[PDB]
Amino acid sequence: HKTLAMDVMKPRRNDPLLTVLTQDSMTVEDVETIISETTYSGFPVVVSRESQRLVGFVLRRDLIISIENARKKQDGVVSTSIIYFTEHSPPLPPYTPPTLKLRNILDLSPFTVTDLTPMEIVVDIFRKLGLRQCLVTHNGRLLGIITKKDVLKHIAQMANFNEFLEV
Amino acid sequence: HKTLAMDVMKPRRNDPLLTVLTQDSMTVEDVETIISETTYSGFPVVVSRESQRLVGFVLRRDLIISIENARKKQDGVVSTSIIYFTEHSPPLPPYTPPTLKLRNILDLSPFTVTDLTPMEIVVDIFRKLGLRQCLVTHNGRLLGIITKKDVLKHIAQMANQLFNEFLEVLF
Amino acid sequence: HKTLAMDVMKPRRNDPLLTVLTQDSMTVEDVETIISETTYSGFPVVVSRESQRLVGFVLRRDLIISIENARKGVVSTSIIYFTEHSPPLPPYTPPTLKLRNILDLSPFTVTDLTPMEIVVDIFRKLGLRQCLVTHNGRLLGIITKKDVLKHIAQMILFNEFL
Amino acid sequence: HKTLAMDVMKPRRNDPLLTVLTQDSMTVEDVETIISETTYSGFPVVVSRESQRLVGFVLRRDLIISIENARKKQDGVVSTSIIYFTEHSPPLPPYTPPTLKLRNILDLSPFTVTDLTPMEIVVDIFRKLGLRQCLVTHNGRLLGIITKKDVLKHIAQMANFNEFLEV
Amino acid sequence: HKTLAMDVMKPRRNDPLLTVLTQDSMTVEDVETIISETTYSGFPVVVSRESQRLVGFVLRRDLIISIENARKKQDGVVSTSIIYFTEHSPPLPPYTPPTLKLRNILDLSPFTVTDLTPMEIVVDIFRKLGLRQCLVTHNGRLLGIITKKDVLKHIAQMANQLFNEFLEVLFQ
Amino acid sequence: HKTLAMDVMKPRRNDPLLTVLTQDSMTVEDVETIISETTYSGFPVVVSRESQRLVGFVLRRDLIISIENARKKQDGVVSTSIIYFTEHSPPLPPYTPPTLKLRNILDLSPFTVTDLTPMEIVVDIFRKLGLRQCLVTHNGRLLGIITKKDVLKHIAQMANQDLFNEFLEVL
Ligand SMILES: Nc1ncnc2c1ncn2[C@@H]1O[C@H](COP(=O)(O)OP(=O)(O)OP(=O)(O)O)[C@@H](O)[C@H]1O
Ligand SMILES: Nc1ncnc2c1ncn2[C@@H]1O[C@H](COP(=O)(O)OP(=O)(O)OP(=O)(O)O)[C@@H](O)[C@H]1O
Ligand SMILES: Nc1ncnc2c1ncn2[C@@H]1O[C@H](COP(=O)(O)OP(=O)(O)OP(=O)(O)O)[C@@H](O)[C@H]1O
Ligand SMILES: Nc1ncnc2c1ncn2[C@@H]1O[C@H](COP(=O)(O)OP(=O)(O)OP(=O)(O)O)[C@@H](O)[C@H]1O
Ligand SMILES: Nc1ncnc2c1ncn2[C@@H]1O[C@H](COP(=O)(O)OP(=O)(O)OP(=O)(O)O)[C@@H](O)[C@H]1O
Ligand SMILES: Nc1ncnc2c1ncn2[C@@H]1O[C@H](COP(=O)(O)OP(=O)(O)OP(=O)(O)O)[C@@H](O)[C@H]1O
Ligand SMILES: [Cl-]
Ligand SMILES: [Cl-]
Ligand SMILES: [Cl-]
Ligand SMILES: [Cl-]
Ligand SMILES: [Cl-]
Ligand SMILES: [Cl-]
Ligand SMILES: [Cl-]
Ligand SMILES: [Cl-]
Ligand SMILES: [Cl-]
Ligand SMILES: [Cl-]
């Protein structure tokens, strides 16, 4: 009966899984096919798909420019080059291509809310803090995302309730 | 060096670990001793000690009332009764006393900030949202706590001193 | 230990009572003499001096303008009323004057026992120039914006009220 | 022209008087019966019914708890004890049963607005100070009450003009 | 795509030009006919008509009171008396009637926005600063006006659709 | 003496005129020497030096980036190439090099305040709108600039006093 963060977050019920980058296991081609196949403004970065523990958030525009420059740089970066967002590379097999550190375009302090947070509180946070997006979590794990336009679409939905009257 | 959330949060460098409750595995006696041995206004609730995954925040004031109400009823809840913050009671062996659900006093939406967040941005969040406290995390794992008083103490340190940074509180 | 509105409000203990105006018993001269003696930024208006019931607040800068323009059968013995209509006067008395349209009919009020941390809070959140202090419906004193500032200079717990 | 506080306040025209407490003359059963026959979140307290000079505002919650704990205390509190919200008891004859002071649960600083105050301002005050209710006075005389729920219903009705857009 | 200050500002396309006062060159009579023939709350005053450089904003009611009080004085102030909002009286031909200084009723700090400014930004400024009106310029030249009611009408129209700009208002 | 915007704005009487770019007549070489010789975060662009009519505000960051890119390209910009911020190019003599349109990095709606605006009002505006800087005009003409830091320093001066009541209002 009470609208919560999980009710508004994407993905919804019949939506695909959250489009996420791993901190350690994405190749340059993986991320490029993500950039070409999506229009999302940004991507959460997690430790692994298993943990779904949030490492940060990275914008599409930054990735394009970074990777674009990277292949353009002759450090030898190729398609099968592993990208990492950690300070140091992960352990790599004998004959593997040069890596690409993208730590410097990662937002290490993304705004996050619990899935059980009331939407009234999320709306308020968005207004007072001027958020462009919010990540939604359950017990430390990444579940979904709420953007500014999602918040607006939710407000619109209510407008047709007394919770709409207090916003 | 810019001051971050990790620089203001407790525990400080090489102090004992955050005083936390588990969502599942602590008894009334556990909580009783924690309450008895500490004066903290509240406690983070974590999935487990090894996971340190944040579940919520629970006030001492509220723990006291609930545990004292649980005693008076004399309905099986004893010192060896398990306290749980989940929706359902944890699976327990035979002859174990009834459990105590304290979920209704758990704040399941505590505010959180990464350990790397600039204190400037923390101070602003406290001001804009009127936070009583803030929890500090690393990669989804609970690390520390900052309270309104910790922020005020931090601001006071700047106030009478780097003074321009204090004036950033106005903006 | 807690400082209240009655500890900051004027008049202080043993000070001349509030320079107030009435709504039915204030002649032009009585107002002109008050302006020519005091230098307060504004004056409250009450039903009567005996009732001390708050009707509104009128600024000083607003009083002089309206008085000097109405005398250019308004004399020194003309009763000024802050109500909507003139009170019943004897047939011989000269015409009256209405200053209703320059009175703040919705001034802000606080009780004499209101904690200053709340008075200051209301001054910041509403941006008040002044606040009238009452006790059980009766005007008692006044706290201006400068009084709040002088109380802010008094005060650890200072940064908490920011 | 403008809608004023006296257009939204309760009680409405041809409605029953405000359910109020006196500061000196309510007994223990008097208040209890008032509590039982009403559902209002709270009640104003006035010097006397004749004066309607506002003394404070007390919540239903606090009245219930205070009164119940007073009978449990062996001060000798009974059904016919005088309840007062003043600092000291009213002049009583010696043979009268011990009294019950309830000043410590009275809001001595309730927010008040004059009846001529435009609702625009009232809404603003409610929004800026986050009020639960406001008391409406006329020349130092309590006239009515405006709660937050009252204000929201008023905003709702505005939509059905640009006094609405003003808010 | 998104609405600009120039889309909301008045006067609209092909209506008479902004009604302004010059800082230096208009007569008591000029202002009086403007006052009695319009209902605008106020008027921008500009350096000159050729420059359209904003000096300030002046309320109608203040002009009425000030001009009324002046003609009743006299000094001198006749229909052909020049009104100036500058600090000093303008250089004038010999044996002309006394001038009228109305600077003490001029708002020398009006708020201005460029015509290219998004309404979303304009609405936010009006809100946060509590503006009564806003003047709109092009490259330092006065072009138009937007009053609080103009903003309110804009928001109202926005609700009947671009519609996300109205949702941005309910959100801010 | 009530402090006004002209009292806090730069340049002060002792300073050289504002460092400004023109909308139409600066070459790439002109803007590069300016960037080399100054440390200002940004520059107002005016119609012309004589008119000082404001067109916008451009940042140093963006000037550097955009210019570095323009001269890297074949058949791109050279020292003598004219930069412009207008929608269309100015009329140039034939056989002159390619021009550089920098309209796309220009803030076309920079906040502006008249020189006679009380500083108290300027401060309110900075806080409420969250400005980085504010351009100060006299009768439509660009006169000076007030940056956030300028404002913070002005406030600090009022704090380090004992005038102090005027600082308390800011608090
Ligand atoms: N990385 C992601 N993975 C899955 N869904 C996402 C991701 N990022 C955003 N979304 C969701 O997809 C939708 C598109 O959001 P996106 O960030 O692409 O722009 P937006 O916030 O809708 O605003 P706009 O389209 O104006 O930039 C939103 O509902 C958002 O919650
Ligand atoms: N659960 C906890 N475990 C470890 N340290 C804590 C915990 N809770 C609070 N602290 C730290 O202990 C100190 C005091 O905590 P407390 O909860 O008493 O908050 P406080 O507001 O400082 O005290 P008070 O509410 O009386 O002003 C603070 O520095 C706080 O960060
Ligand atoms: N009507 C009044 N009667 C008695 N005292 C008053 C009255 N109005 C204000 N005061 C007191 O007079 C003192 C001076 O305030 P005053 O009204 O002169 O303005 P201020 O607060 O000094 O600010 P300013 O003079 O710059 O407008 C204040 O402490 C105020 O409480
Ligand atoms: N003491 C009172 N006497 C008369 N009417 C009252 C009194 N208190 C409240 N009311 C009116 O009764 C109605 C119900 O108000 P009440 O305080 O009971 O709750 P509310 O403000 O409606 O909020 P909620 O219904 O969610 O508890 C409101 O219109 C209010 O104005
Ligand atoms: N000097 C002016 N010249 C041309 N148009 C103006 C001028 N002043 C205002 N306007 C426009 O004329 C219309 C009426 O403006 P005006 O200020 O008279 O009333 P308003 O903004 O509706 O406020 P009010 O209800 O108090 O009269 C508005 O659309 C406004 O933009
Ligand atoms: N284009 C300019 N011409 C003249 N003076 C300027 C110009 N731009 C800024 N200033 C002034 O020069 C000083 C430095 O401004 P600048 O924008 O370079 O840095 P700042 O914002 O003051 O501080 P910071 O180094 O943190 O950005 C300030 O006093 C500012 O008012
Ligand atoms: Cl894990
Ligand atoms: Cl889990
Ligand atoms: Cl890790
Ligand atoms: Cl009467
Ligand atoms: Cl009486
Ligand atoms: Cl009394
Ligand atoms: Cl031009
Ligand atoms: Cl100087
Ligand atoms: Cl010119
Ligand atoms: Cl000039």
Q: What is the 3-state secondary structure (H, E, C) of D56-112?
A: EEEEHHHHHHHHHHHCCCCCCCCCCCEEECCCCCCCCCCCCCCCEECHHHEECCCCE
Q: Do A90 and A130 fall into the same domain? A: no
3-state secondary structure of C127: coil
The token pair that represents C161 in the structure block: 């009220």
Q: Are B59 and B33 in contact (CB under 8 A)?
A: no
Closest listed residue to residue F138, CA positions, set E11, E56, E166: E56
Judged by CB atoms closer than 8 Å, whether chains meet at C153 and F169 is answered as no
Spatial strand order of the sheet with E100-101 comes to E26-27, E82-84, E100-101
Q: Which residue in the set E163, E164, E170 is minimally distant from A167, CB to CB?
A: E170
Query: Tokens 């435009």 map to which residue?
Result: D118
Q: Are F9 and F145 in contact (CB under 8 A)?
A: yes
Q: Are A134 and B130 in contact (CB under 8 A)?
A: no
Residue E115, phi then psi, degrees to nearest 5: -65, -20
Question: Inter-axis angle of helices E164-171 and E119-129, to 10 degrees?
Answer: 20
Count how many pairs of residues, chain A against chain E, have C-beta atoms within 8 Å: 18
| Pocket lined around ligand 1, Cβ cut-off 6 Å | A 10, 18-19, 39-41, 43, 145, 147-150
Closest listed residue to residue D26, CA positions, set D18, D17, D37, D34: D34
Strands D21-22 and D42-46, by their bridges, are: parallel
Is E43 close to ligand 5, i.e. is its CB under 6 Å away? yes
Is D39 close to ligand 4, i.e. is its CB under 6 Å away? yes
User: What does DSSP assign to residue D118?
Assistant: B
Q: Do C48 and C125 fall into the same domain? A: no
Q: What angle do CA A76, A77, A80 make, to 5 degrees?
A: 125
The DSSP H or E segment spanning D155 is helix D148-159
Residue F131, phi then psi, degrees to nearest 5: -70, 150
Please state, in angstroms and as integers, the Cα–Cα distance from residue B142 to each residue in B112, C37, E147, F17, following that order. Answer: 9, 67, 51, 54
Question: B95 and chain F: CB distance < 8 Å anywhere?
Answer: no
Judged by CB atoms closer than 8 Å, whether chains meet at A141 and B137 is answered as no
Q: Are A9 and A144 in contact (CB under 8 A)?
A: yes
Residue E76 region by backbone torsions, left for phi larger than 0, else alpha for psi between -120 and 50, else beta: left
The token pair that represents D144 in the structure block: 């009515």
Terminal C-alpha separation, chain B: 22
Cα E1 vs. chain centroid, distance in angstroms? 28
**Per-residue buried b or exposed e for A114-140, using 16+ beta carbons within 10 Å of the residue's own CB:** bbbbbbebbbebbeeeebebbbbbbbb
Q: Are A10 and A145 in contact (CB under 8 A)?
A: yes
Segments forming the whole domain that contains residue F41: 19-110
Count of Cβ atoms closer than 10 Å to residue C114 Cβ: 23
Is B131 close to ligand 2, i.e. is its CB under 6 Å away? no
State in Å: Cα F5 to ligand 14 middle. 12
| Closest approach of B139 to chain A, Cα-based (Å) | 5
Q: Do F33 and F88 fall into the same domain? A: yes
Q: What is the Rg, in whole angstroms, of the alpha carbon atoms belonging to chain D?
A: 18
The token pair that represents F118 in the structure block: 């009380």
Please state, in angstroms and as integers, the Cα–Cα distance from residue A98 to each residue in A23, A90, A102, following that order. Answer: 16, 12, 13
Q: Do F23 and F106 fall into the same domain? A: yes
Question: D22 and chain C: CB distance < 8 Å anywhere?
Answer: no
B155 contact residues in C (CB cutoff 8 A): 159
Question: Inter-axis angle of helices A119-129 and E164-171, to 10 degrees?
Answer: 90
Is F25 annotated in some ligand binding site? no
| Closest approach of A95 to chain B, Cα-based (Å) | 31
State in Å: Cα F17 to ligand 6 middle. 13
What total number of domains does chain D contain?
A: 2
Please state, in angstroms and as integers, the Cα–Cα distance from residue A30 to each residue in A21, A22, A45, A104, C32, following that order. Answer: 9, 10, 14, 19, 85
3-state secondary structure of F98: coil
Q: Are C45 and C20 in contact (CB under 8 A)?
A: yes
Which are the contacts of C122, defined by CB distance < 8 A and separation ≥ 6? C108, C110, C128, C131, D129
Please state, in angstroms and as integers, the Cα–Cα distance from residue F119 to each residue in C110, F125, F147, following that order. Answer: 31, 10, 13
Count of Cβ atoms closer than 10 Å to residue A72 Cβ: 9
Q: Are A139 and B53 in contact (CB under 8 A)?
A: yes
Q: Do C134 and C82 fall into the same domain? A: no
Q: What is the C-alpha to C-alpha distance for residues B123 and B117, in angstroms, rounded to an integer?
A: 10
Judged by CB atoms closer than 8 Å, whether chains meet at C139 and D140 is answered as yes
Chains B and F touch (3+ CB pairs under 8 A): yes
Of all ligands present, the nearest one to the C-alpha of C53 is 11
**Per-residue buried b or exposed e for B71-101, using 16+ beta carbons within 10 Å of the residue's own CB:** eeeeeebeeebbbbbeeeeeeeeeeeeebbb
Question: Inter-axis angle of helices B60-73 and B28-37, to 10 degrees?
Answer: 140
The token pair that represents E33 in the structure block: 């006919």
| Closest approach of F170 to chain E, Cα-based (Å) | 16
Q: What is the C-alpha to C-alpha distance for residues A18 and A134, in angstroms, rounded to an integer?
A: 13
Question: Inter-axis angle of helices E28-37 and E60-71, to 10 degrees?
Answer: 140
Q: What is the C-alpha to C-alpha distance for residues A57 and A49, in angstroms, rounded to an integer?
A: 15
3-state secondary structure of B44: strand
Touching partners of E (3+ C-beta pairs < 8 Å): A, D, F
State in Å: Cα B162 to ligand 14 middle. 26
Q: Are B108 and B125 in contact (CB under 8 A)?
A: no
Q: What angle do CA F162, F164, F168 make, to 5 degrees?
A: 135
Residue type, E155: I
Looking at chain A, the residues that come just before a C–N gap of over 2.5 A are: 160
The token pair that represents E118 in the structure block: 């998004």
Question: D131 and chain A: CB distance < 8 Å anywhere?
Answer: no
| Closest approach of A63 to chain D, Cα-based (Å) | 42
Q: Are C118 and C143 in contact (CB under 8 A)?
A: no
Q: Are D100 and D28 in contact (CB under 8 A)?
A: yes
Question: F168 and chain B: CB distance < 8 Å anywhere?
Answer: no
Q: Do E90 and E134 fall into the same domain? A: no
Residue-level length of chain F:
171
The token pair that represents C121 in the structure block: 């809070």
Which are the contacts of A14, defined by CB distance < 8 A and separation ≥ 6? none
Q: Whose CA is nearest to atom 15 of ligand 1?
A: A40
Looking at chain F, the residues that come just before a C–N gap of over 2.5 A are: 162
**CATH number of the domain that residue D116 is part of:** 3.90.1280.20
Q: Are E48 and E21 in contact (CB under 8 A)?
A: no
Instruction: Mark which residues 134-153 of C lie under 8 Å from F by CB.
Output: 146, 149-150, 152-153
Q: What is the C-alpha to C-alpha distance for residues E117 and E110, in angstroms, rounded to an integer?
A: 17
Residue type, E116: L
Judged by CB atoms closer than 8 Å, whether chains meet at E156 and D166 is answered as no
Is D15 close to ligand 4, i.e. is its CB under 6 Å away? no
Please state, in angstroms and as integers, the Cα–Cα distance from residue F31 to each residue in F26, F28, F93, F96, following that order. Answer: 7, 5, 21, 18
| Closest approach of A67 to chain B, Cα-based (Å) | 24
Q: Are C88 and C67 in contact (CB under 8 A)?
A: no
Q: Which of C144, C151, C154 to mutate to test the pocket of ligand 3 (most atoms within 8 A of CB)?
A: C144
Q: Which atom of ligand 6 is nearest to the CA of F146?
A: 31
D158 contact residues in E (CB cutoff 8 A): none
Q: Which atom of ligand 1 is nearest to the CA of A43?
A: 1
The secondary structure of chain E, three-state, reads: CCCEHHHHCECCCCCCCCCCEECCCEEHHHHHHHHHHCCCCEEEEECCCCCCCEEEEEEHHHHHHHHHHHHCCCCCCCCCCEEECCCCCCCCCCCCCCCEECHHHEECCCCEEECCCEHHHHHHHHHHHCCCEEEEEECCEEEEEEEHHHHHHHHHHHCCCCCHHHHHHHHC
Judged by CB atoms closer than 8 Å, whether chains meet at A55 and B128 is answered as no
Is F41 annotated in some ligand binding site? yes
Q: What is the C-alpha to C-alpha distance for residues E155 and E13, in angstroms, rounded to an integer?
A: 20
Q: Which atom of ligand 3 is nearest to the CA of C17?
A: 4
Q: Do F59 and F88 fall into the same domain? A: yes
Q: What is the C-alpha to C-alpha distance for residues A63 and B127, in angstroms, rounded to an integer?
A: 33
User: What does DSSP assign to residue C162?
Assistant: -
Q: Are D10 and D65 in contact (CB under 8 A)?
A: no
State in Å: Cα C26 to ligand 10 middle. 15
Question: Inter-axis angle of helices A148-158 and A119-129, to 10 degrees?
Answer: 130
Q: Largest Cα–Cα distance in chain C?
A: 65
Domain closes at, from B110, B137, B153? B110
C134 contact residues in D (CB cutoff 8 A): 140
Q: What is the C-alpha to C-alpha distance for residues F121 and C36, in angstroms, rounded to an integer?
A: 32
A125 contact residues in B (CB cutoff 8 A): 129
Question: B168 and chain F: CB distance < 8 Å anywhere?
Answer: yes
Please state, in angstroms and as integers, the Cα–Cα distance from residue B166 to each residue in B119, B123, B160, D48, F131, following that order. Answer: 11, 10, 9, 51, 18
Question: Inter-axis angle of helices D28-37 and D60-70, to 10 degrees?
Answer: 140
D165 contact residues in E (CB cutoff 8 A): 152, 155-156
Residue D43, phi then psi, degrees to nearest 5: -140, 135
Which are the contacts of E156, defined by CB distance < 8 A and separation ≥ 6? D162, D165
State in Å: Cα E41 to ligand 5 middle. 6
Closest listed residue to residue B71, CA positions, set B63, B38, B20, B25: B63
Spatial strand order of the sheet with E106-107 comes to E21-22, E42-46, E54-59, E106-107
Is D40 close to ligand 4, i.e. is its CB under 6 Å away? yes
Closest listed residue to residue A126, CA positions, set A137, A109, A108, A113: A113
The DSSP H or E segment spanning B120 is helix B119-129
Q: Do C46 and C96 fall into the same domain? A: yes
The token pair that represents B93 in the structure block: 């062996």
Q: What is the C-alpha to C-alpha distance for residues F43 and F49, in angstroms, rounded to an integer?
A: 13
Q: What is the C-alpha to C-alpha distance for residues E151 and E144, in angstroms, rounded to an integer?
A: 14
Q: What is the C-alpha to C-alpha distance for residues E114 and A51, in angstroms, rounded to an integer?
A: 51
Residue-level length of chain C:
162
Q: What is the C-alpha to C-alpha distance for residues E89 and E98, in angstroms, rounded to an integer?
A: 9
Spatial strand order of the sheet with F141-147 comes to F112-114, F133-138, F141-147
The token pair that represents C62 in the structure block: 């607003």
Residue type, E52: Q
Q: What is the C-alpha to C-alpha distance for residues D54 and D108, in angstroms, rounded to an integer?
A: 9
Closest listed residue to residue F5, CA positions, set F142, F106, F163: F142
Where do runs of H (alpha helix) occur along chain F?
5-8, 28-37, 60-72, 119-129, 148-159, 164-170
Please state, in angstroms and as integers, the Cα–Cα distance from residue E169 to each residue in E123, E159, F143, following that order. Answer: 8, 10, 34
Q: Are F100 and F28 in contact (CB under 8 A)?
A: yes
3-state secondary structure of C78: coil
Q: Are A28 and A72 in contact (CB under 8 A)?
A: no
Cα D44 vs. chain centroid, distance in angstroms? 2
Closest listed residue to residue E140, CA positions, set E114, E122, E111, E106: E114
E168 contact residues in A (CB cutoff 8 A): 152
Domain closes at, from D95, D110, D125? D110
Question: B112 and chain A: CB distance < 8 Å anywhere?
Answer: yes
Question: D165 and chain E: CB distance < 8 Å anywhere?
Answer: yes
Residue type, B83: I
Q: What angle do CA B128, A128, B157 make, to 5 degrees?
A: 25
Q: Do E12 and E41 fall into the same domain? A: no
Question: Which pairs from A30-35 meet CB under 8 Å and 24+ separation?
Answer: A31/A63, A31/A67, A31/A83, A32/A67, A32/A79, A35/A60, A35/A63, A35/A64, A35/A67
Question: D81 and chain C: CB distance < 8 Å anywhere?
Answer: no
Q: Do C154 and C125 fall into the same domain? A: yes
Closest listed residue to residue B151, CA positions, set C159, C158, F170: C159
Q: Are E59 and E16 in contact (CB under 8 A)?
A: no
Query: Tokens 């209704």 map to which residue?
Result: B104
Q: What is the C-alpha to C-alpha distance for residues A40 and A11, in angstroms, rounded to an integer?
A: 12
Q: Which of C19, C41, C52, C149 to mutate to test the pocket of ligand 3 (most atoms within 8 A of CB)?
A: C41
F161 beta partners: none
Q: Which atom of ligand 4 is nearest to the CA of D146?
A: 31
Query: Tokens 């944890």 map to which residue?
Result: B90
Judged by CB atoms closer than 8 Å, whether chains meet at D109 and C114 is answered as yes
The secondary structure of chain A, three-state, reads: CCCEHHHHCECCCCCCCCCCEECCCEEHHHHHHHHHHCCCCEEEEECCCCCCEEEEEEEHHHHHHHHHHHHCCCCCCCCCCEEECCCCCCCCCCCCCCCEECHHHEECCCCEEECCCEHHHHHHHHHHHCCCEEEEEECCEEEEEEEHHHHHHHHHHHCCCCCCCCC
Q: Are C6 and C141 in contact (CB under 8 A)?
A: yes
Q: What is the C-alpha to C-alpha distance for residues A136 and A151, in angstroms, rounded to an integer?
A: 13
Q: Do C98 and C138 fall into the same domain? A: no
Question: A166 and chain D: CB distance < 8 Å anywhere?
Answer: yes
Is E10 annotated in some ligand binding site? no
Q: What is the C-alpha to C-alpha distance for residues A120 and A113, in angstroms, rounded to an integer?
A: 12
Q: What angle do CA A158, A159, A162 make, to 5 degrees?
A: 65
Strands F42-46 and F21-22, by their bridges, are: parallel
User: What does DSSP assign to residue C153?
Assistant: H
The token pair that represents D34 in the structure block: 């008032």
**CATH number of the domain that residue C83 is part of:** 3.10.580.20
Of all ligands present, the nearest one to the C-alpha of A51 is 7
Dihedral sign (CA D117, D119, D120, D126): positive
Q: Do B67 and B91 fall into the same domain? A: yes
Q: What is the C-alpha to C-alpha distance for residues C77 and C55, in angstroms, rounded to an integer?
A: 23
Of all ligands present, the nearest one to the C-alpha of A46 is 9
Q: Are C121 and C5 in contact (CB under 8 A)?
A: no
Terminal C-alpha separation, chain D: 17
Judged by CB atoms closer than 8 Å, whether chains meet at C136 and D109 is answered as no
Q: What is the C-alpha to C-alpha distance for residues C25 and D137, in angstroms, rounded to an integer?
A: 23
Domain closes at, from E81, E110, E139? E110
Residue A77, phi then psi, degrees to nearest 5: -70, 130
User: What does DSSP assign to residue D5?
Assistant: G
Q: What is the C-alpha to C-alpha distance for residues C6 and C3, in angstroms, rounded to an integer?
A: 8
Q: What is the C-alpha to C-alpha distance for residues F16 and F14, in angstroms, rounded to an integer?
A: 7
Please state, in angstroms and as integers, the Cα–Cα distance from residue F105 to each residue in F37, F57, F66, following that order. Answer: 21, 9, 9
Q: Are F87 and F108 in contact (CB under 8 A)?
A: no
3-state secondary structure of F112: strand
Q: Are D45 and D85 in contact (CB under 8 A)?
A: yes
Which are the contacts of F132, defined by CB distance < 8 A and separation ≥ 6? F41, F147, F148
